[PDB]
Amino acid sequence: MAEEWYFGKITRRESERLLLNPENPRGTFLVRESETTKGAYCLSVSDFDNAKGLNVKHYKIRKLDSGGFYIWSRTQFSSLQQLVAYYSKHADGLCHRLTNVCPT
């Protein structure tokens, strides 16, 4: 479907390398396949910590039978685009709203 924020089959280390770029504003993000569980995905986002510096938080996106995806079971979605659209307007669990697509 070609969404710029979707990187697919990249490792976690690859996702942190892209997100830990110093030019990324807080809330920069991407969605990728889980590097550990077949069928699962992940939302990786950038944030800053005074003591340690730039950091990346990873959220496991579970994919149901069934269709559907969710970070927390109380807020579910029919697709990955719907999930990103939502969190792009409401943190609702996240430390911050998804602010910017991570540059490829």
Binding site: C42, K57, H58, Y59, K60, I71, W72, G93
Partner: peptide, 7 residues
């Protein structure tokens, strides 16, 4: 290491 997964 995922924020939403305790275990």
């Amino acid at each position: 290491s995922y924020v939403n997964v305790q275990n």
